[PDB]
Write a protein that binds this ligand. Structure first.
Ligand SMILES: Nc1nc2c(ncn2[C@H]2C[C@H](O)[C@@H](COP(=O)(O)OP(=O)(O)OP(=O)(O)O)O2)c(=O)[nH]1
Ligand SMILES: [Ca+2]
Ligand SMILES: [Ca+2]
Ligand SMILES: [Ca+2]
Length: 341
DNA sequence: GTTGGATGGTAGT
DNA sequence: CTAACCCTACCATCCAACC
């Protein structure tokens, strides 16, 4: 079984360069403007020229403006990138209808049947990169392995505008040699628990007591890592299905005032309900980000679909429930829908 | 025991 | 207002209602 993974290069920023070809070769930074003050908010992403200077996805815009004053700062246009993204997903579809869209800019193809070996798979990767550059002038990075996880890694090892195979040989070695903190799914907190344990490599997990590992990182992660290690990982490529859709906004200033918070919450509901598109949710959750940025939420599942009217009425109740129970001012407010019929 | 709801932690993009 | 967006997946834990 062979799996090809495609992840587009500095996406949002690359789209901006294609739409505006003068930008290429200069620093470009795509920003989410929060509205709270001149340049309040965060960097969605930035091109490699910009990354050279410490400007990356996630930092605060005014810090980007600090460390790289003279770059090009562009406002995020999520719908433009999504149209490009849709056109590209359809290209990848030409190459295999067995596709798994994992986000705005990346996908896993199962190519077990288009190709007999890694060499052909490699050439298909080459055939892919070309088509996308032909049709959407977008460069991408391709990872090929026997499974999602190791394909992802191959891609990570090749960014930007690269293509890499990890063959059965490589897989065997990376199990023995690749730092554990580099396994997709193993973030900071986890990685820390694993070193206190003395597990630095995927292989280290084999020679430990399952119940001792579990009783540190959780069941799900423990099984997962051991599966990886035993080279028994075989999660198929499956058509992704949204489990929840929502929207959360940033207020002009922090409040506790229901009158002041309400138009933000309602804005979220409109956008959220519009993004649903013939989907009927049985569960609503109001989500609040506090002064000190701790995230907090109150929900309700009904036994039936929620109509836009129920959602309205319900989200106010729930926002009150937060305010009743947490006495910190609120900074961002939004809503989330789930359990679609 | 079962599942499944509320809330929150962790991870990733 | 003085930095920290935006969105979704999956999982753990704390309960409760129950086959
Ligand atoms: N608003 C916002 N958007 C983000 C954030 N992280 C990623 N994105 C968006 C912008 C990216 O172009 C798009 C794909 O992200 P990626 O993680 O794949 O990296 P990107 O393509 O930007 O650079 P690439 O070479 O992978 O590193 O997702 C974030 O923290 N906030
Ligand atoms: Ca990506
Ligand atoms: Ca990318
Ligand atoms: Ca990590």
């Amino acid at each position: 079984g062979i799996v090809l993974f495609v992840d587009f290069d500095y996406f949002y920023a690359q789209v901006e360069e294609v739409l505006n070809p003068s930008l290429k070769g200069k620093p470009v930074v795509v920003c989410v403007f929060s509205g709270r003050f001149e340049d309040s908010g965060a960097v969605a992403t930035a091109n490699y020229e910009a990354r050279k200077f410490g400007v990356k996805a996630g930092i605060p815009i005014v810090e980007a403006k600090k460390i790289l004053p003279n770059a090009v700062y562009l406002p995020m246009r999520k719908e433009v990138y999504q149209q490009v993204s849709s056109r590209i997903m359809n290209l990848l579809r030409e190459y295999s209808e067995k596709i798994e869209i994992a986000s705005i800019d990346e996908a896993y193809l199962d190519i077990s049947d288009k190709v007999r070996d890694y060499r052909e798979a490699y050439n298909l990767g080459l055939e892919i990169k070309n088509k996308i550059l032909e049709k959407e002038k977008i460069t991408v990075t391709v990872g090929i392995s026997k499974n999602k996880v190791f394909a992802k890694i191959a891609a990570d090892m090749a960014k930007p505008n690269g293509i890499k195979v990890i063959d059965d040989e490589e897989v065997k070695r990376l199990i023995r040699e690749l730092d554990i903190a580099d396994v997709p799914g193993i973030g900071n907190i986890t990685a820390e628990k694993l070193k206190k344990l003395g597990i630095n490599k995927l292989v280290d997990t084999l020679s430990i007591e399952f119940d001792k590992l579990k009783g540190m990182i959780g069941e799900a992660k423990a099984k997962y890592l051991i599966s990886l290690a035993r080279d028994e990982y075989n999660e198929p490529i499956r058509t992704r299905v949204r489990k929840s859709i929502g929207r959360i906004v940033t207020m002009k200033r922090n409040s506790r005032n229901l009158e002041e918070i309400k138009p933000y919450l309602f804005r979220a509901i409109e956008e959220s309900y519009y993004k649903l598109d013939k989907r009927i949710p049985k569960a609503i959750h109001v989500v609040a980000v506090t002064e000190d940025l701790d995230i907090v939420s109150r929900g309700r599942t009904f036994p039936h679909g929620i109509s836009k009217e129920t959602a309205y009425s319900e989200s106010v109740k729930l926002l009150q429930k937060i305010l009743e129970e947490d006495e910190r001012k609120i900074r961002r407010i939004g809503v989330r829908f789930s359990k679609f019929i």
